[PDB]
Amino acid sequence: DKATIPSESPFAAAEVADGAIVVDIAKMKYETPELHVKVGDTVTWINREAMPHNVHFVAGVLGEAALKGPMMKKEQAYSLTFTEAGTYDYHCTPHPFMRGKVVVE
Template sequence: MRTALLAAFCLALPFSAAHAADAIEIVEGGAPSANAIVIDKMAFATPEIKIKAGDSVTWTNKDTMAHNVHFRQGPAKGAPNAQGKMLATDATWTVKFNTAGEYSYICTPHPMMKGKVIVE
């Protein structure tokens, strides 16, 4: 009986695709973040940015060719391995950083384009 009640209670809880334990969370829709990184001339204009845990970063492609943001799996436990969609000119992509650490990334088709988000 207790098991059935516990199961019913758990099913009644709201479900979220992102969990508090997720190091990063992709933000769909909504307003761009105040922490902005422009992609232009085959480079991330701000190759390194420092933010606080819980803050978001928005990348905006101002280049004439498509780019993306690919977080490379790091040595730290729980480091993300996430790849953003290809961004056409003026397209944006926003990520919320929930866990302190260093998050290195590249543009997959142009791996010489590198950046890092440092979350304090």
């Protein structure tokens, strides 16, 4: 689609890739709510708190279906590699007031 998923399930924050563009999740917010990256870049969200979070792109944004990411526990991470330019809105599934955007340039 417009993103590929390195790992379908969450992994440890200590195992995050070098050259990784990290967005921290803390205080019930995405710490960088508007992130600008380049085509081919991998973005990694890291949950820093006890409450589970994810990222959720509705249908028609990264592809035909919705991409509802897995729930991340504390100090778990999840990556998306963006393969096409565009503006990609997302929210948190359990907490939809948490909103962010990845702009791929």
